Amino acid sequence: GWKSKEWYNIEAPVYLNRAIVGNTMAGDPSLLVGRNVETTVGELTNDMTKNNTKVILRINNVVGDIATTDLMGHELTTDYIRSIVKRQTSRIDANVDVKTKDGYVIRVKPTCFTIKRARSSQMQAIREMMVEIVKKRAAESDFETFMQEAILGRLSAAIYRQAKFIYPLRRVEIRKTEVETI
Amino acid sequence: GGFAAEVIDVIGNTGMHGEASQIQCRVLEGRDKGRVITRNCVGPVRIGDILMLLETSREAKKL
Amino acid sequence: MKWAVAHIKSSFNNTIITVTDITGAETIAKSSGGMVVKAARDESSPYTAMQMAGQLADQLKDKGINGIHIRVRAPGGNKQRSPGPGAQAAIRAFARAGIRIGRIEDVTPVPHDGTRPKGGRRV
Amino acid sequence: MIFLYKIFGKWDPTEVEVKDLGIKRYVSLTPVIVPHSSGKHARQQFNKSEISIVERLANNLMRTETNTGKKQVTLRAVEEAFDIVNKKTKQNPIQVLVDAIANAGPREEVVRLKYGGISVPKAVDTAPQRRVDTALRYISMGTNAAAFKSKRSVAECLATELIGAANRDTKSFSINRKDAKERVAKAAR
Numbered sequence: 001g002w003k004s005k006e007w008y009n010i011e012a013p014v015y016l017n018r019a020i021v022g023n024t025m026a027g028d029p030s031l032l033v034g035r036n037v038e039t040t041v042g043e044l045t046n047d048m049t050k051n052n053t054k055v056i057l058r059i060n061n062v063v064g065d066i067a068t069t070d071l072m073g074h075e076l077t078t079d080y081i082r083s084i085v086k087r088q089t090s091r092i093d094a095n096v097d098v099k100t101k102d103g104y105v106i107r108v109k110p111t112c113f114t115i116k117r118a119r120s121s122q123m124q125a126i127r128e129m130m131v132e133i134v135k136k137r138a139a140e141s142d143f144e145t146f147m148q149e150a151i152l153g154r155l156s157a158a159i160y161r162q163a164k165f166i167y168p169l170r171r172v173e174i175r176k177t178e179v180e181t182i
Numbered sequence: 183g184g185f186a187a188e189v190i191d192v193i194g195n196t197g198m199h200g201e202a203s204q205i206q207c208r209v210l211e212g213r214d215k216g217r218v219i220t221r222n223c224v225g226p227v228r229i230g231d232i233l234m235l236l237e238t239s240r241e242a243k244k245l
Numbered sequence: 246m247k248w249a250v251a252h253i254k255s256s257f258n259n260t261i262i263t264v265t266d267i268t269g270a271e272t273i274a275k276s277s278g279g280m281v282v283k284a285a286r287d288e289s290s291p292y293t294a295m296q297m298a299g300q301l302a303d304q305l306k307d308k309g310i311n312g313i314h315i316r317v318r319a320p321g322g323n324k325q326r327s328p329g330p331g332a333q334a335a336i337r338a339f340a341r342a343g344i345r346i347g348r349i350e351d352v353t354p355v356p357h358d359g360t361r362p363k364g365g366r367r368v
Numbered sequence: 369m370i371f372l373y374k375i376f377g378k379w380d381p382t383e384v385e386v387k388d389l390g391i392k393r394y395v396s397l398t399p400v401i402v403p404h405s406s407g408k409h410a411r412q413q414f415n416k417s418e419i420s421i422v423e424r425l426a427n428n429l430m431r432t433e434t435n436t437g438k439k440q441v442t443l444r445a446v447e448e449a450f451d452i453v454n455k456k457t458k459q460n461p462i463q464v465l466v467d468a469i470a471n472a473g474p475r476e477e478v479v480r481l482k483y484g485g486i487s488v489p490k491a492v493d494t495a496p497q498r499r500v501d502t503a504l505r506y507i508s509m510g511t512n513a514a515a516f517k518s519k520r521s522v523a524e525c526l527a528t529e530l531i532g533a534a535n536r537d538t539k540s541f542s543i544n545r546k547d548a549k550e551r552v553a554k555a556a557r
């Protein structure tokens with residue numbers, strides 16, 4: 001059983017320096033086709049700063065002893081998400097699907113927080129500007145650059161500097177970035 | 183392994199009718215010397231007793 | 246350098262543990278509370294959790310893995326939500342077994358408003 | 369001066385080293401000319417920490433109802449058992465006894481703790497004084513049980529018990545009771 005099933009390695013996206021993640025062993029070469037690899041931004045680029053987010057990677061083809069993987073979005077951890085949420089901070093949840101330059105469709109869920117208990121009207125304005133800014137990021141930037149801004153945190157700071165005028169946002173994140181198309 | 187440890191202080195007592203107590207011995211009788219392991223000891227427990235365990239990995243929780 | 250992930254379903258009645266690779270579609274070692282211990286009343290104990298972690302660490306060493314992340318979960322949802330006592334006991338027993346531990350995540354499935362929570366209130 | 373005191377004028381407790389390192393600081397090898405110190409166990413507790421061990425083993429041998437007030441016959445049985453252990457099992461006899469105590473003294477014991485919402489005793493470490501007391505109690509029980517209803521003398525059965533619990537003979541009552549209590553402690557970890 002264990003001896004018969006051989007071993008394989010992994011290969012990260014090219015835009016993440018084609019990095020190495022881990023090794024997964026299966027009985028056959030085609031068995032790793034369609035297998036999600038859950039790893040964090042920190043381990044993909046050996047830095048402890050970006051650890052609260054785990055990236056999602058999908059196998060696309062086994063190039064010999066190496067399994068190339070597709071970055072199918074990220075998602076903030078449950079504990080960190082529940083830690084950011086506090087009292088008197090009306091978190092502006094949202095959900096938008098967009099089309100990048102490459103034609104990828106990404107269902108992004110950008111979230112917002114406020115220093116005080118934000119009114120409903122300001123929350124609606126923040127959500128509308130958030131959806132519009134995410135649309136402009138997807139339209140004006142391709143898949144890899146926009147998702148680097150999103151996962152690495154450029155998109156959150158961009159939302160902070162583009163949507164702070166209506167109300168002081170305590171903190172902004174992009175908790176879910178599920179990927180639909182290619 | 184049958185490692186040991188010596189009672190360096192007595193936190194108090196533990197149990198319903200007195201019984202044992204809470205002791206933080208220092209494990210100095212094995213490969214894992216330098217570890218202070220909280221444990222409960224029944225009887226007239228005293229400071230400096232070289233109490234020898236059958237397993238010293240476990241530690242009694244905080245009361 | 247082989248990296249694995251151990252799944253710990255800790256409950257108030259049992260603390261089943263299974264160990265998989267990074268992709269998760271292949272399991273390496275597995276052992277529940279009653280798998281090694283014959284008392285259902287003691288299947289959820291921290292001592293049983295350390296026994297399970299010890300009996301999984303040697304199989305991990307045989308397979309060739311020395312470090313595992315921890316994805317601890319309660320039953321979650323319409324049942325017990327918080328993690329049981331076996332999680333920290335299993336992780337500490339793994340670390341005392343020589344197997345290195347990196348990230349440990351509490352990944353109990355939390356429902357916003359799921360199905361109807363079965364309960365008797367006072368009973 | 370200290371005139372090199374030996375137990376009953378025969379066995380000096382100075383030239384004996386303890387095996388169980390925790391029990392060394394409680395079981396006393398202090399030289400006393402006679403095992404009738406008549407201890408003072410009321411000023412505090414654990415007043416036996418400075419008392420001799422031959423006296424303590426002779427006064428834990430009066431478990432029986434008729435044995436109360438009979439420290440003389442207990443010392444007689446102690447002396448003849450020491451003679452038997454020295455003869456058939458040639459060695460330092462108090463060394464054999466201290467090995468027996470360190471081997472048949474309960475390392476672990478189970479005590480009731482109502483944690484987890486269940487009536488369950490928890491397995492705990494045993495105190496050195498408590499462990500020495502239980503070792504002496506089980507030695508007395510084995511001696512009394514063998515010596516009752518038997519063709520073998522009290523001191524002969526005590527010597528058999530000491531040889532059983534000293535050389536790790538599995539047939540001794542003290543060894544079997546210590547293993548039984550440790551098994552019950554393992555059952556309720």
Ligand SMILES: [Mg+2]
Nearest residue numbers: 365366367368
């Ligand atoms: Mg009812």
